Structure 1
């Protein structure tokens, strides 16, 4: 069902994550971690204290799809382990240094063609697929976007609800 999902999404904040490559999203799904650039890291750390749930919605650049969504379970932390990210051309390894722990809510894909009816007030009402890494998605648009994803029956939201 969708009832526990709706409960997790209640009064949540939503951020669009854009990854340059599929490998880091795969690593994030395997290890329950994410790292971003310092500007976005500060925003997510602020949001984590501000909201009952902070939801990251992932899209790999050029894929035409979202790859899933996850909830922050921690602020960023250093020195736990050097996650073997694949660095973009130019991107150093100290720029992706802060590691957030995340709990996946859905590891299924959603093509952009299915979200074409959703616009983001915080990005000039452009379609929600449009946005830079870290773009905040307003509550109503982000809730409907998450509800569009196919159900991920491999995930049990009971433990996610307890961390709230």
Structure 2
């Protein structure tokens, strides 16, 4: 069904996360973690305190698709085990956010062409810098476009809200 998904997304905030490669998204899916540059780390930490759910929607640059979406389960922290990200230095990154995946399935950009993001000049929602916020209605509809991910049980995520 889609009812628990809709509940998780109610009054959520949404951020576009652009990865330079598939390896980092694979690491994020396997380990439930993300790290971004401090400019975006500060925005995500502010959002985490401000809303019931903060949703990261992932797209690997040049792939023509989104690779899934996840919900922040924590503000960023430092001092964990070093994550072997593939970078173009690791010190340049901010802290590490724990995330709970909501959907690990892909969605091609051709399927989101009817969705524009008011917070990026009403450009198609696929267009945006890493960290671009997606307005609530556009973000909800985008997440609802993804194929259902039957491996996921949102019961435990609902309890974190």
TM over 0.5: yes
Hey, what does 2:84 align to over in structure 1?
Answer: 84
SS at match of 2:150: coil
Alpha-carbon separation, structure 1, partners of 2:92 and 2:7: 34
Alpha-carbon separation, structure 2, partners of 1:97 and 1:59: 20
**Conserved? CA contact 2:117–2:124, under 8 Å:** yes
TM-score by length of 1: 0.97
SS at match of 1:94: helix
**Conserved? CA contact 2:28–2:34, under 8 Å:** yes
**Conserved? CA contact 2:41–2:94, under 8 Å:** no
* 1:78-137 CA-partner distances (Å, limit 9, x unpaired): 01111110012xxx2112241000000000000000000000000000000000000000
SS at match of 1:11: coil
TM-score by length of 2: 0.99
1:58 offset after TM fit, Å? 0.1
Alpha-carbon separation, structure 1, partners of 2:73 and 2:94: 17
Alpha-carbon separation, structure 2, partners of 1:126 and 1:50: 25
**Conserved? CA contact 2:48–2:72, under 8 Å:** yes
RMSD over aligned CA atoms reads: 0.5
Alpha-carbon separation, structure 2, partners of 1:66 and 1:116: 13
Moved over 4 A (4+): none
* 1:27-73 CA-partner distances (Å, limit 9, x unpaired): 00000000001100000000000000000000000000000000000
Whether 2:101 is the aligned partner of 1:104: answer: yes
Structure 2: tracts of 5 or more residues without a match: none
Hey, what does 1:152 align to over in structure 2?
Answer: 149
